[PDB]
Every structure is written in C-alpha cells, then in structure tokens.
Amino acid sequence: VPYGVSQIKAPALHSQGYTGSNVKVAVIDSGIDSSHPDLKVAGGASFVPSETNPFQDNNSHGTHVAGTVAAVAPSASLYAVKVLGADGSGQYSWIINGIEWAIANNMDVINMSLGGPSGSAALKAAVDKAVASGVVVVAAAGNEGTSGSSSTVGYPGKYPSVIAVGAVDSSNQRASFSSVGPELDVMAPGVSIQSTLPGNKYGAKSGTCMASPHVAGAAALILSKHPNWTNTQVRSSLENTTTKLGDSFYYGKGLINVQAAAQ
Ligand SMILES: [K+]
C-alpha cells in the first residue's frame, strides 16, 4: 500500500495468502480509533487512569502505529493497549501494566512505539517475562540521533530481549533522528509514513515509532506462515535475512526483508 510496506517486501507474502491471520498484535500506545473504517480492532484495555476507553485515540499516535501494523499484516488481530494519554506521555506503571496485560491475554506480538531515557527492574522484568512466555517484543529504538560515541537507544529498546527498531527513509538511508547503539537490532521505514489517523483520516508521521510497527507487522506475517515457530526463531529470521546497510551501531543488522525471513 504505502511505500514502507513494499520496501520491507510484505506484498510478496500477501500475494501468497500470508496476511497475519490468527496473530494477536498488541499496540501498546495511545489507544486505537476503532471507528476508523480501515481498522479492525479485536480488543484491548486501557491503563491510563483518566482515559478509560482504549478505543478512543485522543493523541493520533496509536492509530497511526496500528494502521502500519495493519498495512503490513492486514489479517492480524489488533489490540489497543492504551498506556499513553492525549499528550502522548504515560507513566512507567501504565506501560508495565499494559505489558502485563499483553502477556496475560496471549498476545503474539507486542509493539512499543515508545521509549524512555531510563530503565527499571519492573520494565526489564515485564519485557523478559513476555519473551520467556513466547511473545515477540518489538520497540522503537528512540529518536535521539547521535551522541558522541554512546548509545542513544531508549528503554525498552535497550534490553536484549526486545527487538529495537531504527528508522530508514525510502532510500535505505538512516534517518538523522534514529537512535544509535549496540542495542539497535533492525531497520524499518520511518520517514513520512502514511497511516491511519482518528476520525477517518490518513497522514504521515516520522520516527522510529513508525519503523517499529513494520517489524511488528513483519513478525505477524512470519507467524501466519510458521505458527509453530518460537519468538526466538521469528527474531533470528528477521535479523539474519536483512539487507545489510552500514555499521550495526547505526543500522543494526540492516533493513528487514519479510520475504526472505518468512522462508
Ligand atoms: K535490543
């Protein structure tokens, strides 16, 4: 549909009848506008104390992330895990509560197009438990760019259990904003991403946040072909089948190729 879908080689799988059917993807974000004609929301939960409806997206972020998951894996069961309020901010407890729900509710893929500058024993415990429980955990690397020689990969992206996603444009160039470090795993399209917006709209957003869902959608396609495959196997296939770009500090393993990873 959008250029980023074709770029990751998703359409080849779609033509084959692999569209992410029976894959439960949790969008741990600002909610999802379930009212959008182009989105099918299966369930979810809100963990934002003042915004009790997960199906009301007061930000726009979670609907845009969800629509990218949907563009990659059209048949995937989308779950709106509302952890971020109208301002796009959320407390760590709300976020961790949303991961805890995703595990509890047998989500196959977690998408976290979110990041914080600091970790916690509780955040690491939550991601680790998800992984140990066979969930594919995908997160945005962060929008911190370059910072001397140091990692600018945010949390939870920083944790070895999480697939940390960096952003490339349509040319396969690293976006100037894309966080860097040894914890960067893969690259996906993350510059001027056309996706669904609340109130039957479409618009572009840029960020590693936009790159993350292409991988979460990519993990849904793999699981649709290979329902038997472990989260470990899904991850290894995505990482081992990449189009090799530059240095792993900047590009991770390179750009994901869903066609090559699906075998
Ligand atoms: K990581």
Curated annotation (Swiss-Prot):
GO terms for biological process: fibrinolysis; proteolysis; sporulation resulting in formation of a cellular spore. Optimum temperature is 48 degrees Celsius. Ca(2+) 1 binds at D38. Ca(2+) 2 binds at G157, Y159, V162. The active site is at D29, H61, C209. Its cofactor is Ca(2+). Used as a detergent protease. Sold under the name Alcalase by Novozymes. Completely inhibited by phenylmethylsulfony fluoride (PMSF) and partially inhibited by benzamidine hydrochloride, leupeptin, and pepstatin A. It is found in: Secreted. Its EC number is 3.4.21.62. Optimum pH is 9.0. Binds 2 calcium ions per subunit. Its main location: secreted. The keyword Repressor does not apply. GO terms for molecular function: metal ion binding; serine-type endopeptidase activity. Keywords: Calcium, Hydrolase, Metal-binding, Protease, Secreted, Serine protease, Signal, Sporulation, Zymogen. Subtilisin is an extracellular alkaline serine protease, it catalyzes the hydrolysis of proteins and peptide amides. Has a high substrate specificity to fibrin. Secretion of subtilisin is associated with onset of sporulation, and many mutations which block sporulation at early stages affect expression levels of subtilisin. However, subtilisin is not necessary for normal sporulation. Monomer. Belongs to the peptidase S8 family. This is Subtilisin BPN'. The chain holds residues 111 to 382 of 382 of the full protein.
